[PDB]
Amino acid sequence: TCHIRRKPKFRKFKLYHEGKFWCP
């Protein structure tokens, strides 16, 4: 599922260890 208010952008580490959810 993909539901986010602020899509991922301008980030260094991808899929880091912070909340399992990567899909706006």
Swiss-Prot record:
Tissue/organ expression: Strong expression in hemocytes, heart and muscle, with weaker expression detected in gills and hepatopancreas. No expression detected in eyes.
Induction: By injection with lipopolysaccharide. Expression is highest at 3 hours post-injection, decreases to basal levels at 12 hours post-injection and is up-regulated again at 24 hours post-injection. In the presence of recombinant ALF, the expression is significantly down-regulated at 3 hours and 6 hours post-injection.
Disulfide bridge map: 2-23
Cell location: Secreted
Highest taxon above the source species: Eukaryota
Reported function: Binds to bacterial LPS and may specifically inhibit the LPS-mediated activation of the hemolymph coagulation. It has a strong antibacterial effect especially on the growth of Gram-negative bacteria.
Stated name of the protein: Anti-lipopolysaccharide factor
Residues of the full protein shown: 54 to 77 of 123
